[PDB]
Design a protein around this ligand. Sequence first.
Ligand SMILES: Nc1cc(-c2ccc3ccn(Cc4ccccn4)c3c2)[nH]n1
Ligand SMILES: Nc1cc(-c2ccc3ccn(Cc4ccccn4)c3c2)[nH]n1
Lengths: 203, 212
Amino acid sequence: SMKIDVVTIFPEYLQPVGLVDVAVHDLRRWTHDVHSVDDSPYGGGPGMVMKPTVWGDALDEICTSETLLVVPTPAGYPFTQETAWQWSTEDHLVIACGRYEGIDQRVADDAATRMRVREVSIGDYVLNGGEAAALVIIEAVLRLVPGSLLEGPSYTRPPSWRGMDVPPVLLSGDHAKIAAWRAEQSRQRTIERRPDLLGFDSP
Amino acid sequence: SMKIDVVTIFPEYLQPVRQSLPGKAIDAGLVDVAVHDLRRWTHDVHKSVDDSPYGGGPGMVMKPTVWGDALDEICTSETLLVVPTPAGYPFTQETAWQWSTEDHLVIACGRYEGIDQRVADDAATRMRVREVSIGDYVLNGGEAAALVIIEAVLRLVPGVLSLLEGPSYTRPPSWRGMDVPPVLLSGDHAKIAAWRAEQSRQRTIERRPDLL
Ligand SMILES: Nc1cc(-c2ccc3ccn(Cc4ccccn4)c3c2)[nH]n1
Ligand SMILES: Nc1cc(-c2ccc3ccn(Cc4ccccn4)c3c2)[nH]n1
């Protein structure tokens, strides 16, 4: 059993969500001011940084000492399939979705004193916020909840379509020849598309 | 000006993007995002999108017949076809920059064990096709991958929306026993830049040693 809490300033983005309960929290519910979640960065620079004070009160109410705090960030550790397996057995996940240029560092540092904190990246691209990354994390984790190489090409009926035939080995019904072909196709694809997985230089 | 078409069996998954778009960008004709149900192009009364894999195996493969019809109607010869897949080329920031100047993007969102390979192969004979992965993890479909692709591409299109970045700080100067690093309040902007560069290198060594 697992509980996932997602904290964000845009709770509407998280709308695409027995054994698991998923709750979305608006961060602006923890502001006592009439107007603000963001302020200018110390030391200068572009954009805005999310204030630590608002995040502190939100995570104090939601998180326990057993909580694993997930902070999506482009500067984080790589979130992989290995990470997804490690997180699928967790009791409580809190995903802190940032916006603007990110969250004040002291939020992750403060939470690390009472709980386990993971700053993670889902890929080498920049998103506008952690909301999209949260949806990626949730999907990757939840499909592994109890209850190595690139995948080869997949085919289904008809056997001939638009003048393109399904590879005749798959129709033959020879399990040993099918497995040998599929392994060949997977290894040829991994060389071409992701040579790093087999231990070669990226293009 | 950019048109994005998304084809999926779950069109409700792509509600975040359409909601997150500002009205000013749509009214100026900079962006038009349209979501299409794949079951519009089904042939049978049961509205079948999937069928059993050739050569055995677990799970199901999405039908080439239904997908072929959908792409014939939506795609032109100037279309760049984006097909999210765990076995694809890596989608990076460089990939996002290249696609930000494109006129027509069609994202084909698969489910089950993926789409019949002949769909992309047929499309490759008359248009540019990109099979892409957003990371080294497996999702249930291409819908979450599409939201990632759309957000990354569109934020680089103006008005629509290397080492690792160091720690960022804001008000207050003191919070829960932690002070903002005094260098950031010194007024020595040469020293700040050098401090930020060192923090960037330290974070890169610790978190992403592959980039060095
Ligand atoms: N793998 C990832 C993670 C992210 C991500 C996660 C959370 C936030 C909150 C804000 N931004 C924007 C932003 C812009 C400039 C520098 C830092 N951050 C985020 C981006 N994108 N791609
Ligand atoms: N970087 C990526 C891409 C995907 C992705 C994209 C599209 C589909 C359509 C179906 N599945 C599930 C599935 C499971 C087992 C083998 C093949 N596919 C998808 C997964 N996940 N992570």
